[PDB]
Amino acid sequence: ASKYAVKLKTDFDNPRWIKRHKHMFDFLDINGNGKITLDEIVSKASDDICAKLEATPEQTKRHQVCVEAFFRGCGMEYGKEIAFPQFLDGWKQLATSELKKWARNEPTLIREWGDAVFDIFDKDGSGTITLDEWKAYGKISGISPSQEDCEATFRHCDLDNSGDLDVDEMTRQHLGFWYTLDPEADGLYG
Ligand SMILES: O=C(Cc1ccc(O)cc1)Nc1ncc(-c2ccc(O)cc2)nc1Cc1ccccc1
Ligand SMILES: [Ca+2]
Ligand SMILES: [Ca+2]
Ligand SMILES: [Ca+2]
Numbered sequence: 001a002s003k004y005a006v007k008l009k010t011d012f013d014n015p016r017w018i019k020r021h022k023h024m025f026d027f028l029d030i031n032g033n034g035k036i037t038l039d040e041i042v043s044k045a046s047d048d049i050c051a052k053l054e055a056t057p058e059q060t061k062r063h064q065v066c067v068e069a070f071f072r073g074c075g076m077e078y079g080k081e082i083a084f085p086q087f088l089d090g091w092k093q094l095a096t097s098e099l100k101k102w103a104r105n106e107p108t109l110i111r112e113w114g115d116a117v118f119d120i121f122d123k124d125g126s127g128t129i130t131l132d133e134w135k136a137y138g139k140i141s142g143i144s145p146s147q148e149d150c151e152a153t154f155r156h157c158d159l160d161n162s163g164d165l166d167v168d169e170m171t172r173q174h175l176g177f178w179y180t181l182d183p184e185a186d187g188l189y190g
Contacts (some may be wrong), residue, residue, distance in 0.1 A: 002159045003168040006102050007180040012092050017181045021091055025084050035081035041071050052141040063116040070109045073097070095179040102175075107113045110179070114171035130163040149190030156187040 011017050032039045046067045064097040074090030076082065076119070098108045121129045121137060140146035144153060159169045162166050176185025 002184065003166070003172050006099070006172060006175060007182050008099065008103065010092075010095055010099065010179065011181045012095075012160045014181055018088065020178070020181075021088055022084065022163055025087055033062070033081075034086055035083055037081055038068065038076040041076060049117075049141055050120070053120045055119075059116070059120050063113075065121065066109070066113040066116045070113050073109055076159055091178075098175075099179060107173075110175050111171050113169060114174055118167040118170055127166070129170070131164070134165065144190055146158075146190060150158050153187055153190055 024093045025036055028041050028044045028174060029036050042064060046060075047066045050063050055063065073094045075086065076090065076092070094109075098110055101108050118129065121133055123133060123136075131151070131154055135147075135150055138150040138153075139146070142149040154165070157165050157169050157173050159172070171186045173188050174183030
């Protein structure tokens with residue numbers, strides 16, 4: 001099943017992979033000084049996202065713990081200012097390590113993060129994300145930025161064409177977009 005099929009090979013020297021991360025580094029660099037801290041990352045990728053998704057305190061704590069673990073896996077730390085080339089080096093180490101974990105059936109930081117996000121989107125605890133649940137927070141949270149893109153990306157994530165998203169579909173597409181430059185994940189953010 002495509003929802004469990006992940007590439008064994010990264011493409012770190014592909015300019016498209018580098019540019020995806022470059023776009024994020026600049027987005028997350030709040031004070032615009034060309035260095036990223038774990039403070040800035042957690043503020044934009046966690047504080048702001050959880051608030052916009054209307055997470056509970058418990059869901060926010062859990063998502064923050066995931067994001068901290070994930071970005072420390074890239075060499076990030078609170079108060080530690082890191083320029084982009086080193087940021088990218090951290091991502092290279094992280095992706096390589098996590099893909100080995102994936103292939104050995106060991107837990108991954110990326111799947112833990114996906115669980116935390118999925119839990120918030122799944123407001124009724126159905127174990128599924130319906131189109132209405134997705135549309136509610138897609139544009140608001142900053143994940144989709146258009147209605148067209150939002151409905152497209154939903155169809156694109158719904159790998160088994162069930163009309164709804166499960167945690168494995170979502171995570172596998174997130175991992176494909178950020179770790180492996182997987183062409184099957186290309187539409188995730190519109
Ligand atoms: O996209 C998400 C949410 C998410 C969705 C599915 C899933 O399985 C796991 C997480 N988060 C995310 N996922 C990845 C990154 C990220 C990626 C690369 C990078 O260099 C730094 C941050 N940042 C973020 C935060 C963010 C902020 C604003 C708009 C979109 C997303
Ligand atoms: Ca900064
Ligand atoms: Ca649901
Ligand atoms: Ca599905």
